[PDB]
From Swiss-Prot:
Effect listed in the UniProt record for changing residue 47 to L: In mut3.3; shifts fluorescence lifetime from 3.03 to 1.88 ns. In R10-3; matures to the red-emitting state with excitation and emission maxima at 555 and 585 nm, respectively
Effect of residue 145 to P: Increases fluorescence at warmer temperatures such as 37 degrees Celsius
Name of this chain's protein: Green fluorescent protein
Effect annotated for changing residue 148 to I: In Azurite; shifts the excitation and emission spectra to shorter wavelengths and increases quantum yields compared to BFP
Annotated consequence of substituting residue 196 to S: In EBFP1.2; shifts the excitation and emission spectra to shorter wavelengths and increases quantum yields compared to BFP
Gene name in the database record: GFP
Amino acid sequence: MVSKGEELFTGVVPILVELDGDVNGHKFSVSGEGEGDATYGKLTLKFICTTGKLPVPWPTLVTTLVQCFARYPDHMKQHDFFKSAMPEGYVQERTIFFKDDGNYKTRAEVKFEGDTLVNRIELKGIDFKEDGNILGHKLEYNAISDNVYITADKQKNGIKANFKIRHNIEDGSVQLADHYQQNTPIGDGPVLLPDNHYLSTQSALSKDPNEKRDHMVLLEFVTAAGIT
Ligand SMILES: [Mg+2]
């Protein structure tokens, strides 16, 4: 048996994302739309900065901008917290430490609004260097990929995760972003508390040749692994 929430993901699901951000006082908003097909761990999304120019690099916002779309192998379906929390949803919180630079703190609510999966986020960044790789826009517009390591957090009826993102700098070096994550259900029903495992995630970044607004197109694959 799969969670009741998992039943909501058997087809292609529309996705909406809304983010309000403030990084060193630079305020901005992002809207996104697309679709997810969890059977294949597959997402296609387009994001637009609705306030003008984005004041940080797009790659630094990818992880913030719906892990309920992960493909869990049949043998791992009892470990999918994210879908189990649906439709009422979950809160996803992170702190993201950019090595030798500032940090993002994020709080999001991910839930269904009818048949649409919605991710609403607030992001606050502090302590960035004005001429660092973030505020100085020194990060290449490059894919990110890595493993999200998940553990249960029984005391909050949820999960924690940690991972690293190695962003390529234009000079050939690396800007590390150390992620710390916690997710807690919004509803009061039972959820699936997992054994340790990870999400293997790959995000490909591109541009819409017809789009003049500041934007990001993503094609992403997310697959659970690490058990059997
Ligand atoms: Mg301070």
